[PDB]
Design a protein around this ligand. Structure first.
Ligand SMILES: *[C@@H]1O[C@H](CO)[C@@H](O)[C@H](O)[C@H]1NC(C)=O
Ligand SMILES: *[C@@H]1O[C@H](CO)[C@@H](O)[C@H](O)[C@H]1NC(C)=O
Lengths: 49, 244, 98, 367, 105, 49
């Protein structure tokens, strides 16, 4: 199957999702975030020294 | 554009031999049994029913990727600029400012500052595909989920990025009677179709009569909105009514 | 392997951030096999996601929660097992890890 | 100064269409075709080598070709390539030909060897050049604008392009085993021949001279040549070295590509009259050419059309102007003036007709 | 090479934390929350001082010197409350959910 | 984590994002020194106090 899920943004904790595919034994799986990074706009104005 | 590397077909004589798999970009393999070869002196081999043939092929980037490519970009709102001529005491002073309210330029004790644009309209969207003289407000497929036979046939971040994801359905077929060749199925690309139907160029389809110019991308003459412009100036250029 | 004769039990549970609960499940699998375990409600959570089972035995797991009277439906190889626990508050006021 | 093809051989390949209905094993059969040069120049990988003799000289007016398992030589003057019109030979290097060529469903290459017998090979190849800029033509004009494109160049020392060269496995030639009252006479002609037989004695093994292995049939045995000295590139058409994958070897594949400008033609200026918020354009062709137009309101309201003959089109212009582009020329801008009048200040009312300039058919609701 | 700082001694109270801290050189201290607001705060310090801090319902971060940030977290505190013939419940509902779930009482 | 990067590991495909909250801890004008960054309002080019 394709499976969609949503997890909280808590870094370093296991979240468990379950694939309940009929015709098959179910499969539980664990997600754990290590890092979530945001790189903003690289718009320089000027320098100062 | 891509190149399909097909090596010489393995002719396994008088028995069988299967291929040891590897993670090449679209590695594809199949061994056909019961096949027959042909050459100058008839069949290349001596056995007839026990001739098997291993066939393997894959796809890489081209030499034309070194200079010719389309690029999928993400873009958003703009930091505009302006060129502004002023006749000042019969003198043609031309300034260049940044049309966002955060740049003042000084010339001949004159402090020009343009404002923020009263609108924020662009003719652009987020996903923008460029080729070398024009741009398009097109939705490319996401990276890695590249659909076959279109944009998304092959994908890589940079031309230096040695990893190339592909999706083209290169599956081999059974070769003919005696004819030593490798029949591979068809592989339609993005350049095989897209460069014949680019259609609406944004140079030609821009609302409000803007023009485009590439390297870097820039839209000029977007006639909408209105520019606040302020000027600071001292009393030296004025004169009292006692001289008027 | 499907499983029969399920009956759960809680030796001693304390609802906290740690491995604060222990549970024990009687079971009889049909043969040797790796299989999953899933907490049906969201309050209980099982650390050890899947285990190997053989047949008539019992198995110990560790769980976390927040509630004292943890009522619990748990799916194993799909079979719903029910259990109930009367947990206790922990002794430490403040720990560092979330 | 580019003397690197010394471990090469111009092999012979199974061509599916040499003309004359059915296939052959032609010495000159092409394998790999390149058409990514946007002007439409063709980079052809052929099974020959040119400009290099058997002693690997730089004699750039000759060619190598193997025949009867021997690299013989011939002259490049007989070379012909053909889609539909007699094409031109431009770039000449080893296993690679560059040619600028017209339209065609198919492509073929052919020439005459050193025994005055001409051979060819034909592949269907949907070669139609892509349009460049916005126009097409009979041919290059001697004048026009300059638009960017890309072409092949004429360098032979091109780095960072590679193919692998290695030893070809065998050469099964069954013109050797002759029966002398039922025997087999392996005639090696100074080579190393592998044999494979379903009989007693020397059934399998290797020899060096012409031998007689008696009381067995020709098809009962198998006599292939084992060359061990010169190499070929990895063709996808040859049989492989049948023990593993790629055996070692290397050569580079020059004639690379670079950015260029190219002469795109102009456009004959159409003639134009005006009318009440509209414009009539009689537009001449030179070839099938497109034109486009838009206006400058909130929407652009685009149109693109192709024209081929003397076509007249009327276009209405709203108050924000009109833009019409035609050919590679500059896009023509237009702006609706007050038309001619409706009326002046007459001694009757006779007024509202010039009110049919500014806002016709709206704001007469106020009247 | 910059100096590090000496790790201070620390203990806890019911939903708060007392940190007794030892400098030798004049050293900063800062702390914040990880909620929607930072409620950011900072002090210089020069002497062996104690501080009290209120850990929120979501989590506190404190940083002393150049050390890696001492992060801290609300565990539900203790037991003065159980299940019996009286309630012994509301201190449960003082520990979890203060100032509300008493509103439903 | 913006919904356009399909990536696979041992023919297992993942698509992550886009984020359910596009808030940033940044404002628009940032000064950056070689170790540090600050949200502040610098004066524009040519209007230096
Ligand atoms: C200033 O430039 C304009 C063209 O932009 C020109 O028409 C005008 O005569 C110039 N005036 C002077 C004083 O140079
Ligand atoms: C050729 O020029 C185009 C733009 O004219 C540029 O994008 C491309 O990178 C250039 N390629 C080389 C090899 O110089």
């Amino acid at each position: 199957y394709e499976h969609v899920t949503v997890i909280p943004n808590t870094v370093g904790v296991p979240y468990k999702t379950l694939v309940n595919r009929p015709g098959y034994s179910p499969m539980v799986l664990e997600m754990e975030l290590q890092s979530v990074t945001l790189e903003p706009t690289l718009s320089l104005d000027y320098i100062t020294c | 554009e891509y190149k399909t590397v097909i090596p010489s077909p393995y002719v396994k004589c008088c028995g069988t031999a299967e291929c040891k798999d590897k993670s090449l970009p679209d590695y594809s393999c199949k061994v056909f049994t019961g096949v027959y070869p042909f050459m100058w002196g008839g069949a290349y081999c001596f056995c007839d029913a026990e001739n098997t043939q291993l066939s393997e092929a894959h796809v890489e980037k081209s030499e034309s990727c070194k200079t010719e490519f389309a690029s999928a970009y993400r873009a958003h709102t703009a930091s505009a600029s302006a060129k502004l001529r002023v006749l000042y005491q019969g003198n043609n002073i031309t300034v260049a400012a940044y049309a966002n309210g955060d740049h003042a330029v000084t010339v001949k004790d004159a402090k020009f500052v343009v404002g923020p644009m009263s609108s924020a309209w662009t003719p652009f969207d987020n996903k923008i595909v460029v080729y070398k003289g024009d741009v398009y407000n097109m939705d490319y497929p996401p990276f890695g989920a590249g659909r076959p036979g279109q944009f998304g046939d092959i994908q890589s971040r940079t031309p230096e990025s040695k990893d190339v994801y592909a999706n083209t359905q290169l599956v081999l077929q059974r070769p003919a009677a005696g004819t030593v060749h490798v029949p591979y199925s068809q592989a339609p690309s993005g350049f095989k179709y897209w460069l014949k139907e680019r259609g609406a160029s944004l140079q030609h389809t821009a609302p409000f009569g803007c023009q485009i110019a590439t390297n870097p991308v820039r839209a000029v003459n977007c006639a909408v909105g209105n520019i606040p412009i302020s000027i600071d100036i001292p009393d030296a250029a004025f004169t009292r009514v006692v001289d008027a | 392997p499907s499983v029969t004769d399920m009956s759960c039990e809680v030796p001693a549970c304390t609802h906290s951030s740690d491995f604060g609960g222990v549970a024990i499940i009687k079971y009889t699998a049909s043969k040797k096999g790796k299989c999953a375990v899933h907490s049906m409600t969201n309050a209980v959570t099982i650390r050890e996601a899947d285990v190997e089972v053989e047949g008539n035995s019992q198995l110990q797991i560790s769980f976390s929660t927040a509630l004292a009277s943890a009522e619990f439906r748990v799916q194993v190889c799909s079979t719903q097992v029910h259990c109930a626990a009367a947990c206790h508050p922990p002794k430490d006021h403040i720990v560092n890890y979330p | 100064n580019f003397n690197v093809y010394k471990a090469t051989r111009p092999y012979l390949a199974h061509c599916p269409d040499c003309g004359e209905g059915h296939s052959c094993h032609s010495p000159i059969a092409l394998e790999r075709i390149r058409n990514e040069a946007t002007d439409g120049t063709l980079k052809i990988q052929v099974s020959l080598q040119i400009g290099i003799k058997t002693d690997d000289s730089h004699d750039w007016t000759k060619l190598r070709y193997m025949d009867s398992h021997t690299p013989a030589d011939a002259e490049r003057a007989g070379l012909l390539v053909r889609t539909s019109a007699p094409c031109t030979i431009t770039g000449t290097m080893g296993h690679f030909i560059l040619a600028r060529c017209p339209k065609g469903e198919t492509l073929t290459v052919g020439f005459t060897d050193s025994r005055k017998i001409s051979h060819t090979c034909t592949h269907p190849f949907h070669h139609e050049p892509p349009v460049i800029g916005r126009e097409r033509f009979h041919s290059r004009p001697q004048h026009g604008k300059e638009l960017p494109c890309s072409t092949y160049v004429q360098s032979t020392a091109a780095t960072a392009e590679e193919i692998e060269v290695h030893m070809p496995p065998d050469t099964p030639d069954r013109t050797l085993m002759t029966q002398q009252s039922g025997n087999v006479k392996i005639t090696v002609n100074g080579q190393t021949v592998r044999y494979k037989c379903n009989c007693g004695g020397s059934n399998e093994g290797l020899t060096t001279t012409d031998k007689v292995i008696n009381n067995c049939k020709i098809d009962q045995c198998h006599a292939a040549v084992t060359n061990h000295k010169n190499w070929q590139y990895n063709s996808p058409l040859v049989p492989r070295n049948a023990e593993l994958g790629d055996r070692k070897g290397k050569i580079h594949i020059p004639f690379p590509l670079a950015n260029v400008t190219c002469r795109v033609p102009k456009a004959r200026n159409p003639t134009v009259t005006y009318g009440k918020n509209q414009v009539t354009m009689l537009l001449y062709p030179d070839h099938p050419t497109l034109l486009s137009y838009r206006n400058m309101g909130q929407e652009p309201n685009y149109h693109e059309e192709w024209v081929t003959h003397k076509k007249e089109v009327t276009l209405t212009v709203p108050t924000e102007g009109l833009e019409v582009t035609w050919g590679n020329n500059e896009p023509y801008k237009y702006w609706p003036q007050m038309s001619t009048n409706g009326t002046a200040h007459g001694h009757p009312h006779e007024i509202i007709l010039y009110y049919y300039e500014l806002y016709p058919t709206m704001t007469v609701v106020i009247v």
